[PDB]
């Protein structure tokens, strides 16, 4: 079964679904935060080493998984109608859906396995969760998983 919880960034902005995209908002908004599901992939040895544990990352209600797809010259973060359990239950590592989770204390960064120069990031209030190649400024790449 997967690990579940909410995700916030260092500005205390929680992931929430707004239409067809994930956005990051303060908990003051009183919107239901997405319940994120995370599960470690059974096949780490086949990928890059020393970059953190490769995980599948999805949401419950609606049951969707995050993946990385090249849209022209840009890797983009997308949601696909997919049950995280189906991916974990697949016999091979499904690379577009995988992210290296690199832990530093209470927070972790999420690096695309398909696009290693890009990381999952949030930015300003109510802005979408995207893939970024730009670190340490306007983009927030350190996230906390709150299992409750
Ligand atoms: C809550 O603490 C945990 C934990 C405790 C109890 C139950 C479940 C998890 C833990 C576990 C062992 C030592 C220290 C801490 C947590 O484990 C964990 N495991 C996986 C596979 C992924 C993620 C994860 C994904 C995405 C993001 C963004 C962040 N931040 C973390 N987290 C962790 O390391 O934070």
Author numbering: 21 to 168
Q: Please, what does the article write about this entry?
A:
IL-36 family cytokines, which are members of the larger IL-1R superfamily, include three agonists (IL-36α, IL-36β, and IL-36γ) and an antagonist, IL-36Ra. All three agonists bind to and signal through a heterodimeric receptor composed of IL-36 receptor subunit (IL-36R), which binds selectively to all IL-36 family members and an IL-1RAcP co-receptor subunit, which is shared with several other IL-1R superfamily members including IL-1β. Binding of IL-36 agonists to IL-36R/IL-1RAcP heterodimer induces signaling through MyD88/IRAK complex leading to the activation of NF-κB and MAPKs signaling cascades shared among IL-1R superfamily members.
The co-crystal structure of human IL-36γ and A-552 was determined to 2.0 Å resolution. In the new IL-36γ structure, A-552 is bound at the center of the cytokine’s β-trefoil fold with a calculated pocket volume of 150 Å3. When comparing the apo and ligand bound structures, the C-terminal tail moves in order to open the pocket for ligand binding. Firstly, the carboxylate at the center of the ligand makes key hydrogen bond interactions to residues Arg121 and Lys123. Arg121 also provides a π-cation stacking interaction to the central ligand pyrimidine ring. Additionally, the methyl aniline inserts into the back of the ligand pocket in a hydrophobic space which is outlined by residues Val58, Leu130, Leu165 and Ile27. The structure demonstrates why A-552 likely has a higher affinity than A-553 as A-552 presents the carboxylate in an optimal orientation to engage basic residues Arg121 and Lys123 with respect to the flanking phenyl rings. In this binding pose, less active enantiomer A-553 would not be able to make the necessary hydrogen bonds to these residues due to lack of proximity. This x-ray structure also rationalizes why A-552 does not show affinity for either mouse IL-36γ, human IL-36α or IL-36β. The terminal biphenyl group does not play any specific role in the ligand binding to IL-36γ; however, it projects into the space where IL-36R would be in the IL-36γ/IL-36R/IL-1RAcP ternary complex. The trajectory of the terminal biphenyl group can sterically occlude the IL-36R linker (connecting the D3 and D1/D2 domains) from binding to IL-36γ ligand.
